[PDB]
Amino acid sequence: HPVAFRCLDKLGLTVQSVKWDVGKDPQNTQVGDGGMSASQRKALQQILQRPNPTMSGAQLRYSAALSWACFGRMAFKVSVMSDGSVNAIWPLGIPFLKQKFDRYGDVESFQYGDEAGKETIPSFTKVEKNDKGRPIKNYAFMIVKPSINGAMNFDVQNTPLQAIGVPVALYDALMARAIDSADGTPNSKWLVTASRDLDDGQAKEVKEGIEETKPGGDNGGEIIFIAGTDVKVQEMKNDLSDIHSKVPLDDQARTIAGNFGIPIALLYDESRKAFFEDTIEPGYLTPLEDGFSMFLCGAGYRVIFDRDSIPALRKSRADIAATYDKVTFITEEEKREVTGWPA
Amino acid sequence: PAPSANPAKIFIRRFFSAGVAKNVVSYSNVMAAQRAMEHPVAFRCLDKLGLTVQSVKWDVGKDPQNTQVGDGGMSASQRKALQQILQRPNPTMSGAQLRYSAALSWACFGRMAFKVSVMSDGSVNAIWPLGIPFLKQKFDRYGDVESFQYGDEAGKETIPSFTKVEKNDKGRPIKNYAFMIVKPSINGAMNFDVQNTPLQAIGVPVALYDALMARAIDSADGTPNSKWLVTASRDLDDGQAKEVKEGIEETKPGGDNGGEIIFIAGTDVKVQEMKNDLSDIHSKVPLDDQARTIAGNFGIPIALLYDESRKAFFEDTIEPGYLTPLEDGFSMFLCGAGYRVIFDRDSIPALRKSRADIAATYDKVTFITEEEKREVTGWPA
Amino acid sequence: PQVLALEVDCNIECASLLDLYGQIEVSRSTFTYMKIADYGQLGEYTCDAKCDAEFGEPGNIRHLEGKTYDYRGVFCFNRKNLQEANYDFLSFMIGAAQRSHRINRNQALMIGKGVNEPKGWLTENCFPVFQTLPVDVNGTSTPAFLAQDWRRFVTSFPAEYGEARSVMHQNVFGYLAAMVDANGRFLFGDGDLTFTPDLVRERIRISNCLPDPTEGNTKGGTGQDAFAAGSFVAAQAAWKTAFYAVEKRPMFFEQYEGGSSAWCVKYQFGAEDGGFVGCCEHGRILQI
Amino acid sequence: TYMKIADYGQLGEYTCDAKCDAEFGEPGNIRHLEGKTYDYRGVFCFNRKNLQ
Amino acid sequence: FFTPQVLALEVDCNIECASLLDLYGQIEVSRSTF
Amino acid sequence: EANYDFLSFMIGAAQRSHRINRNQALMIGKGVNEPKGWLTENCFPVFQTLP
């Protein structure tokens, strides 16, 4: 679909733009740091910057946000070598990913494939853990979007596609009317009709006369003189300027756009800053970061993306830094952390 | 390190079959990209995208997230040779033309293909772009591509992929290879999937544009441009019906009696003036809407076809849709860790003001060291 | 108008006589193995003071082989009710096809008939079959099956063959537990309302799609309920060497583009497998 | 209402290994049937003084 | 053209006896008559 | 199965049949469904020896 694909790949592109890095978390009350080795964290940096071969971290970010937007789900695969050192990351095709639950309350393994593919990859919950807690064999993530009535993993999906079926049908139906009436309506003017008694043989003389005035004719610009037997011409209006129904078409585009959380103005800079810090960040950036941060590394250390990366926030961050500099009843360290800059 | 066991074996089982050298793009997609090169708006959008990316300047440099103290600039001479090639590719070709053709194919098909001829020691010799339409690739048994077939019958260079090729003791290749940069899509299928192109969702509007414009060109020549449908009665003695015609006709600018009245004594003749509006033949209202569609799907602010729109077009679709995927694709396999291909943002003539103001205001801040004031606005060290 | 998630189906499988048979995995669709017919006799107790010898009689070494058979099917849809349904026909049918494979494979591997089906050990009829005596009652000679037979059958297995399990329909095992001696005592489990020992210690695996001689549990037999002599009751064999089951590829599911005429999208599934009886001397069959 | 999956059909047939096609099998029934629920109620009275 | 994969099973199917040897009175001679 | 790779034999036995058929066509191919070969068109000047 034109507008649906336009809104999707925009959200995919913008999320793909942020830059990853592992860092100290701000709420580091765990003095018993979970940076188990400081080498797994190094390898974890390499892998977030260079995932599984023939794929970069950018394409990983794009595919994750895209699958999250279409289905409300995010799945991945890890290959921790033997000591908490992750080797590669693979995103999982969510349409044909099946999972099986335990007896108590949760999923334990994921089946990927109907027949030959039968890799019952374990969940992060139950897998061979290290003495500190880090896993040793493969597992999967299955990041889920919350919903009503709980049912953490048993519930229905929560995606914008659930509430745009009616408008998207209206659009494809209306544009079908547009393309249909485009070819099929005559593009001719001047419906000329003769009277009854006109002696074909001179009636054709009337046709060639009225015909031989088009650009390329002979008496163009000139007049038509008909001696007797008044012929009557009528000019067809051929409006043809409302075939796509402009008014009940843009309303649909706004609905299937606003439902995805995109200011209409995008399809001025204030709207860009809003679209970045109101929908993209608190619907794709913070859940992806929290899911990865939850089970990819120990406490005290977690995945972070630098906000300065965003080219739309550079001016915003800049002035905020300037005005805070003028304040005095505040020590330097908190002036730093309020605008990034950990220590 | 590499475990060689990806979950991408889910497709080689029965959804695909190994050793066939399938084509990378559908024949319909090639034709659609072909005919869209003559369409006015599509070609206008297409060459614009390739144009802007072709203005950016390349150079190799240290990467900012350099935690790899064991720098992958294996020789520091391969990097100089790599810099030479990113500025001077294979003869009869400049780096700009590479950027233009590469990003262009990425726009039409969502892929990027290249070829390198590393001499013997990780030193790249030259780089060649590969035609996406007639490029076939061959998959392995586990999960990925091993070779690329480039040509039908005579040209059968079974070029190896980067994954399997004669590597050095450090990891750099010794022989030729290819890239096949891919744009991902739904349902994963890293390489087995359908392309990701704006051309997918512009089929209806372009056909609407051709149809309405075909109506336009047609009705311009075919509708009589003559006025004053004059008509007479069936008693006027054709022989003086001529002279009344010569009376009314000979009033044109530069005539015998030009600009004077027409007096008809008896036998009242009846004139009617046609309209022939002809001022909405192309259906302006349902034309610019289609133009706004095929331009918006390419990620183009309508205003471009004011400065704030140019800034947005640069730092919303061009950079994070053509600059970063090309740069990461190169940086993944063209050089070792710690070093990668960079392009200077300061070379964009539109962003020169914004960086300058951001540099200006940051200067005033004091609870910040000089090095991080630098790195936040380029300027590594 | 209050659709639930309750999915009561109420359909049954068999047990699995698959962990008993010896498992072998092959890649090609044609395997071949050797077999020792007989070692033959070599050397006699010759006399003394005779500078000679005898060549005896050499043995024999046969060379056998067997192929693998395939199992396939087809099922389509209509693509119109699959888009509005409140369920998933595919994942239901994917299970509905594996369900048909597991029960067909096990049954065919048991009772298969020659061509394009692995010859089961039932129809092979080279397992030595043992039939039980009939009993007298009021002059009539109705056939029966007493607990005295079952102990005689299980114990008569040659000891040098190894340990051998037994297979029987659970209705037969119910027939044994409910036997009565002369007055009123049960033979097994005297006075506890139920006799149910650990089968794995008595090495008796139970199934439910064996011939089941007590048809519908309604032919204990005193009058017109006689066992209809000539019915299978139980079997016993060193299964790890008496019968093998080969596997090459599990089931597969492939969309069939072409034949899908834009109304009924048609899937295709299949699998390849097989089995064959080895030395059918380890193994005996009890019969009425 | 709820579902009443009746009987899985017979899908596979163990064909010969020459034909380039399978053979159709019997289908299954789902029997979407329903059921209602009843109600229980009654009353009882009192005085006011006779209860204090 | 079709090479059959040779598996490594070997059915024996023969049968020995038990042995009464250890029960009998073991003894060892060196000449041919005692 | 069939250790001798048959698929590679056919693609090889198809370009070969194509190669010799093309050479045969451009020489004597007759009008419809064949390129008009220069041997059958016969508008080259032709010289003939005398006995």
Which structure tokens are listed for B37?
Answer: 């090169």
At residue A254, the 3 state secondary structure works out as helix
3-state secondary structure chain C: CCCCCCCCCCCCCCCCCCCCCEEEECCCCEEEEEEEEECCCCCCCCCCCCCCCCCCCCCEEEEEEEECEEEEEEEECCCCHHHHCCCCHHHHHHHHHHHHHHHHHHHHHHHCCCCCCCCCHHHHCCCCEEECCECCECCECCECCCHHHHHHHHHCCCHHHCCCEEEEEHHHHHHHHCCECCCCCECCCCCCCCCCCCHHHHCCEEECCCCCCCHHHCCCCCCCCCCCCCCEEEEEECHHHHEEEEEEEEEEEEECCCCCCCCCCEEEEEEEEEEEECCCCCCEEEEC
Please give the angle made by the CA atoms of C141, C145 and C146, to the nearest 5 degrees: 110
Measured CA distances, B231 to A96, A208, A236, B276 (Å):
76, 16, 20, 18
- The DSSP 8-state label assigned to residue A334 in this structure reads H
* Ordered alpha helix ranges (H), chain B: 27-35, 40-54, 78-87, 95-109, 203-220, 241-249, 285-296, 307-313, 324-332, 352-364, 370-375
Measure in Å the smallest separation between the Cα of E15 and chain C Cα atoms: 8
State the first-to-last Cα distance of chain E, in angstroms, to the nearest integer. Answer: 67
Buried b (16+ CB within 10 A) or exposed e, A239-250: ebeebbbeeebe
Measure in Å the smallest separation between the Cα of D39 and chain C Cα atoms: 17
Secondary structure element (H or E) that encloses residue B340, with its range? strand B339-343
State the first-to-last Cα distance of chain C, in angstroms, to the nearest integer. Answer: 56
Give the residue carrying structure tokens 């390190």.
B1
At residue A24, the 3 state secondary structure works out as strand
Of the candidates B140, B85, B71, the one whose C-alpha atom is nearest the C-alpha of residue B116 is B85
Give the integer Cα–Cα distance in Å for A32 and A299: 8
The partner residue sitting opposite A6, judged by closest CB among B65, B225, B296, is: B296
Cβ-Cβ contacts under 8 Å, A98 against chain C: 91
What burial class does residue A195 get, using C-beta atoms within 10 Å of its C-beta: 0-12 exposed, 13-18 middle, 19+ buried? exposed
| Backbone torsions φ then ψ of A226, nearest 5 degrees | -120, 110
Give the integer Cα–Cα distance in Å for A307 and A23: 14
Which structure tokens are listed for A85?
Answer: 């050192």
Pairwise CB contact (< 8 Å): A53 & B2: yes
What burial class does residue D5 get, using C-beta atoms within 10 Å of its C-beta: 0-12 exposed, 13-18 middle, 19+ buried? middle
| Backbone torsions φ then ψ of A112, nearest 5 degrees | -125, 95
Among D8, D24, D29, D30, pick the best mutation site for testing chain C contact (most C Cβ within 10 A): D8
- The DSSP 8-state label assigned to residue B122 in this structure reads S
Secondary structure element (H or E) that encloses residue A74, with its range? strand A73-74
Cβ neighbours of residue A272 under 8 Å, at least 6 residues apart?
A: A266, A312, B312, B316
A and B interact (at least 3 Cβ pairs within 8 A): yes
Residue B94: count other Cβ atoms within 10 Å of its Cβ.
12
At residue B326, the 3 state secondary structure works out as helix
Is residue B343 a contact partner of residue B323, using CB atoms and an 8 Å limit? yes
| Backbone torsions φ then ψ of A87, nearest 5 degrees | -100, -40
- The DSSP 8-state label assigned to residue A123 in this structure reads B
Measure in Å the smallest separation between the Cα of C76 and chain D Cα atoms: 10
What is the distance of C-alpha E7 from the center of its chain?
Answer: 25
Q: What is the largest CA-CA distance in chain B?
A: 110
Of the candidates B176, B203, B192, the one whose C-alpha atom is nearest the C-alpha of residue B39 is B203
Secondary structure element (H or E) that encloses residue A14, with its range? helix A2-16
Task: Specify the pairing of strand C30-38 against strand E5-11.
Answer: parallel
- One DSSP character per residue, A202-251 reads THHHHHHHHHTTSTTSSSTTS-EEE-SS--EEE------S-TT-SHHHHH
Which structure tokens are listed for B334?
Answer: 């063209």
At residue A109, the 3 state secondary structure works out as strand
Give the integer Cα–Cα distance in Å for C187 and C176: 8
Is residue C36 a contact partner of residue E11, using CB atoms and an 8 Å limit? yes
Is residue A21 a contact partner of residue B65, using CB atoms and an 8 Å limit? yes
Nearest-Cα residue of chain D relative to residue C29:
D17
Cβ neighbours of residue B272 under 8 Å, at least 6 residues apart?
A: B228, B229, B231
Nearest-Cα residue of chain C relative to residue A96:
C91
Residue E12: count other Cβ atoms within 10 Å of its Cβ.
11
Give the residue carrying structure tokens 């010794």.
B174
Beta partners for residue A109, in sequence order: A100, A122
Is residue A308 a contact partner of residue B376, using CB atoms and an 8 Å limit? yes
| Packing angle, helices B95-109 and B324-332, rounded to 10 | 110
| Backbone torsions φ then ψ of B241, nearest 5 degrees | -65, -25
Is residue B351 a contact partner of residue B345, using CB atoms and an 8 Å limit? yes
D23 and C CB contact within 8 Å: yes
Secondary structure element (H or E) that encloses residue F38, with its range? helix F38-41
Which structure tokens are listed for B317?
Answer: 């679709």
A221: left (phi over 0), alpha (psi -120 to 50) or beta: left
| Backbone torsions φ then ψ of B148, nearest 5 degrees | -120, 125
Cβ-Cβ contacts under 8 Å, C73 against chain D: 11-13, 22-23, 25
Residue B327: count other Cβ atoms within 10 Å of its Cβ.
19
Give the integer Cα–Cα distance in Å for C16 and C98: 14
Which structure tokens are listed for B305?
Answer: 């076809």
Is residue A164 a contact partner of residue A256, using CB atoms and an 8 Å limit? yes
Which structure tokens are listed for C93?
Answer: 């049918």
Give the residue carrying structure tokens 């990927």.
A112
Which structure tokens are listed for A202?
Answer: 């001179």
Task: Specify the pairing of strand B58-62 against strand B22-23.
Answer: unpaired
Cβ neighbours of residue D39 under 8 Å, at least 6 residues apart?
A: none
B and C interact (at least 3 Cβ pairs within 8 A): yes
- Residues recorded for chain A: 343
Pairwise CB contact (< 8 Å): A114 & C250: no
* Method used to solve the structure: cryo-EM
Is residue C146 a contact partner of residue C135, using CB atoms and an 8 Å limit? yes
Is residue A243 a contact partner of residue B286, using CB atoms and an 8 Å limit? yes
Give the integer Cα–Cα distance in Å for D48 and D46: 7
What is the distance of C-alpha C251 from the center of its chain?
Answer: 21
Give the integer Cα–Cα distance in Å for B139 and C248: 23
3-state secondary structure B237-268: CCCCHHHHHHHHHCCCCCCCCCCCCCCCCCCC
Which structure tokens are listed for C15?
Answer: 């047990």
Which structure tokens are listed for B134?
Answer: 């007639």
Sign of CA dihedral A239, A240, A245, A247: negative
Nominal resolution in Å? 4.5
What burial class does residue A253 get, using C-beta atoms within 10 Å of its C-beta: 0-12 exposed, 13-18 middle, 19+ buried? buried
Which structure tokens are listed for A212?
Answer: 């031989």
The radius of gyration of chain B from alpha carbons, rounded to an integer in Å, stands at: 32
| Packing angle, helices B203-220 and B285-296, rounded to 10 | 150
Buried b (16+ CB within 10 A) or exposed e, A46-75: bbbbbbbbbbbbbbbbbbbbbbbbbbbbbb
The partner residue sitting opposite A224, judged by closest CB among B13, B185, B229, is: B229
Give the integer Cα–Cα distance in Å for B195 and A14: 20
Of the candidates A343, A339, A340, the one whose C-alpha atom is nearest the C-alpha of residue A322 is A339
Is residue B331 a contact partner of residue B72, using CB atoms and an 8 Å limit? no
Sign of CA dihedral C204, C208, C209, C215: positive
Cβ neighbours of residue B102 under 8 Å, at least 6 residues apart?
A: B112, B114, B129, B326
State the first-to-last Cα distance of chain B, in angstroms, to the nearest integer. Answer: 32
Which structure tokens are listed for B7?
Answer: 């979950």
Give the residue carrying structure tokens 């309506």.
A185
B240 and A CB contact within 8 Å: no
| Packing angle, helices A165-182 and B203-220, rounded to 10 | 30
Cβ-Cβ contacts under 8 Å, E33 against chain C: none
Is residue A110 a contact partner of residue A98, using CB atoms and an 8 Å limit? yes
Residue C132: count other Cβ atoms within 10 Å of its Cβ.
20
Give the residue carrying structure tokens 């006015």.
B40
Beta strands in chain E (DSSP E): 5-11
Measured CA distances, C205 to C208, C240, C278 (Å):
11, 14, 21
Sign of CA dihedral B238, B244, B250, B256: positive
C3: left (phi over 0), alpha (psi -120 to 50) or beta: beta
- One DSSP character per residue, B144-179 reads SEEEEEESSSS----EEBSSSS-B-SSS-BSS-EE-
Give the residue carrying structure tokens 């950016």.
B56
Give the integer Cα–Cα distance in Å for C175 and C180: 10
What burial class does residue C67 get, using C-beta atoms within 10 Å of its C-beta: 0-12 exposed, 13-18 middle, 19+ buried? middle
Pairwise CB contact (< 8 Å): C160 & E14: no
Cβ-Cβ contacts under 8 Å, E6 against chain C: 31-33
Beta partners for residue C166, in sequence order: C236
Of the candidates B233, B221, B269, the one whose C-alpha atom is nearest the C-alpha of residue B249 is B269
Q: How many CB pairs under 8 A join A and C?
A: 12
The CB-based long-range contact list for C216-223 (8 Å cut-off, 24+ gap) reads C217/C171, C217/C174, C220/C175, C221/C142, C221/C143, C221/C144, C222/C137, C222/C142, C223/C142
